[model samples]
Target: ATITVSTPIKQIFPDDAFAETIKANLKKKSVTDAVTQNELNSIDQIIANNSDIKSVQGIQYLPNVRYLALGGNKLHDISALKELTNLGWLNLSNNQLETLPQGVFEKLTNLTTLNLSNNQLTSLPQGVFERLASLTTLNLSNNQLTSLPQGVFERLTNLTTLNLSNNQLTSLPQGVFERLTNLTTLNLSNNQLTSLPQGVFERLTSLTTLNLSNNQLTSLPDGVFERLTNLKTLNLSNNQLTKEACRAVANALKQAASLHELHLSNNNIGEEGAAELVEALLHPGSTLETLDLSNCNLTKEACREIARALKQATTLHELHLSNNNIGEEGAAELVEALLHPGSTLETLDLSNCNLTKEACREIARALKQATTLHELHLSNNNIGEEGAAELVEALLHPGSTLETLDLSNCNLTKEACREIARALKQATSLHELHLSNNNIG
Candidate 1:
């Protein structure tokens, strides 16, 4: 008995690259001459990545293909794939796709995953993505898309992941993502988005990870994230957000029950903005594991609030406050917070915090107490010989679990380096030690 397949009416093999792939995949010599109908129907998956295959010309013969990988190829025109309606996963990334072929996705109703990133596509016409109703993941990042057509993603009700980052999209249409209720991860970073429309993220209740970093956003709509109950990771780094936007962000952070990580670095969140965010950071509902406040124009005044939050924050594992002017007073405050027994932190970044010799003593004292602490960053501070000796004593403590210690450019002398090396010989937990850019002569 012989199994048969209904092959499409097209050229058998348009190119030798594609023909050789089929021949090797089927493990049949006749595939080089021509594939068998039974062999065509038997293949459910094809992985021909970086095979230099120019055209997927005769893929219609294998209509039962559920997964296909053609990434890192020289593919530009994909008109032949429009017939592969049964495809559930398709990868066309790292290609030269300047235009999505007309009606290419018309019959692809069962496609659940599609990757078109790292292409040259400049625009997406309307009705292009309206038919991919069953799609759960879509990647169109690293393209040249300037703007999106209205309702382009309207029918993607089941889409849970969307990546449109590293594009030139300046604005999004109203209610463009109204039907994307189950979206869990959305990456819109590295775009030119200046402002988002009202209620843009209001309906996305199940959103967990949202990245809007490196954008031109001045302020988000008040209460825009009021409905994202399951939100976990929210990044707004390198934005122009100011004190006016902090209240809204504070409101959302207070209620986001599952929120774990928050990034507000490189913003204008001065004393006023930190005052607004401190409430949420100290809120009992905060389950944050990582918090980044670097380059927020913070001083000792705002550091007081942050230190208070750290005092009460038990779940916090990583806190980054680098590139600020939080002087010796701020350093002492943080040292006091970490000195407590309950503040068992893992990573504490205080780089460029204007720490002096006194601040080093405070940190040295806390280092002996922060038992769970493994990583500490204090780079760009002027730690002289005495300050270096104090930290060396802390590291030599048998209870020390410190693995990584970055004190680059802290101005240590040759004698200080020799002392640190001697201490490292006796220290078992010190795995990494950074003491670069100092006169160790």
Candidate 2:
């Protein structure tokens, strides 16, 4: 049974100082002041964003407001919202609120979404969000919060998404999120935390996405990730993690069979750490899909380990090894693995790996036999006209599955572009071709 219905479109109105600004601008053009909400008893929505609204004094008259957005304004006091008992969603982001009034949110029992990010909030008063049981999404990122008051999220049983990224939080209090069993996504990236205590996420069995990147964490305890069995995408990039911690996380990955995407870029996990991580990916029960090792200080030896591991794996789809000194010999090693029949890799990033003409020829030869390869990034290399012609020849092959080829900033000239265009006329699967920052003009 197929049916199609047309939904009614609703119009929104501006409130507070934003409405006044619109009125003043219309007066300049001799147009009638069309903004009106003074006689309304139950306003459904108000979008007062991006104005000089410092005070919300008259908002108390409209007690039946359902959705209110006052972002990017000069609001410092929001005490007039206490009477808006029917409010369902509120956004006060990008304001200058250093502290919220106590019990300001106590009347917003039906509030389901709250966004307070990009503010100057140093601390949250107790009982502010005590009555917001229906809140499912909360954003407090880009703030100055160093700590949270006890029982801040005690009554939020239905919270599913929480963002606290880009803050100055050094540590979390014990069992701070024990009551949020329904949390599925949590972001604590770009903080100053050096370590995470055990049992911090022991109860979040339904969590699937977790981001803890850009922190000062050097190590994690073994039990730190033991309970996160359902976590699929974990971002631990831009941290100061050591080899020991990497190895510990590698071993812990054995329990996290559902984890497929792991980002560990911009760290100091050396050759030993790379070996341990590759060993985990080679496990029979592992289902890892994407691995990012960019800027991890990996050299030729680590490349060899990865090359050998990729030859034996089957589920991995994307591999990022950019911004490292894999040199000519190391790239040749990766070429050998790419030619294997068991390799199912789709996207490969070897940009800025000190590749030259010889390495490009080797990669082109491998691409001739690739079956599942779709995207290949070769940017920022010294692959001259000769090497560029080699890749163009491979793209003309009938067996080529390559869809995107990045050859930008590779010292290519007009002759290479002509050859690439000639190949493009015969290529079947190529869709995106990048040749910028070259002498092709």
Candidate 3:
């Protein structure tokens, strides 16, 4: 006779207050294993089940399990993992993992997703991941690593996603990922990198998403990603790029035509640089579908050129122009151009622009002529009730193309929301509306 084994399942919330309800829900099964990380940590009933458990690292471990998570614990040595030969998915995030022992991970051959975020590790051994040939995803976010050894990732050829965010790396050596040609996603966010070497990404042609956000990168070296033509998404948000850098990126994008989304938000591309970028997008050959320029120090003149670009270009479908200094005069002019027949813009964001009531009238006129435009964001503006009424009239019109509207923080009153709501009742095109965070009295 063969024995089919089953472990007890304990249903518990991490909160002690919900212990009784959890027990009631799992009344039929013998509680041998905890179902959740929080519920297991909150209870004192099962703390003595395994002596190998030094602390609850926010993960529920099976008795004599091979893998363990040492996150949020007080343990220094990982000798406890010596017993579990089948252990994988070892997470040491948000703990005091200053340095790993010589062979801490030698036993974890099956490890795949290794997270060492929020640690104090200053250096990584050259063959740190050499033995873990099965490792595919590695996260070193929120660490103090300033540099990587020459052959640091020489063994992680099967890695698909590597996150080195929130680290102290000032720069990455050329060919740091020479062996990771199969990597599809790489995150270098929240680092001190000033520039990525041109040949640094020579091997990562398989990458689809590359994030260099929140770094010290003022400009990218020419041909930095020229070889990454397969890249679908590239994020350079919250860097120190100027309009000149945007120009460099535009040049790069022209070479890498597969890019579908480009993020240049929170940079220094003021009105002058925006003019250059929008012109590049409209340059007859550019194929960018989405462009985000939020908080990029744009001026009214930048919005003027952007509107012109939208009228001239047919490839652009989505444009994010939030958190700029576009004034009422600029907003009116931009909306006036959207009324043209050549404009194929489907979504537009002018939120946080100091738009007045009269400016809303221009937008209403644009909405009347725009056949493809479906979304308009006018939140955080000074659109008084009188102007909002004009917008409502546009929304109420049969030819209005708008499907979604955001009026949050726009000086809307009860009279405004009432009329807007009434118009919305008859609005076949309008579907989603945001009206929170305002004292609409």
**Every candidate's lDDT:** 0.84, 0.80, 0.72
Report the CA-based lDDT of candidate 3 relative to the real structure.
0.72
Which candidate leads the pack in lDDT?
1
Clashing residue pairs in candidate 3 (N, C-alpha, C atoms within 3 angstroms): 8-32, 14-38, 14-39, 66-87, 67-87
Top candidate on TM-score is 1
**Cα lDDT of model 1 by residue, 301-358, tens digit:** 8888887888777789999999898887888878777767788578999888888888
Better structure of 2 and 3 per lDDT: 2
Query: Please, what are the lDDT tens digits per residue for candidate 2 over residues 1-441?
Result: 111232111112234465464334334232233323432443567777887787765566566679898899988888888878888889999999888888888888899999999999988887688999899999999999988777788888899999999999888876778888899999999988888887788888878888999999887776777778888988999998877777657855687888899898888888888898888767787788898998888888998899878887778899999888887777888877888888888999988888888888888887775478889999988888878888878878888889999988888786777677667767788888888877743
| Model 2 CA lDDT for position 265 | 87
Q: Which ten residues in a row have the lowest lDDT in candidate 3?
A: 44-53
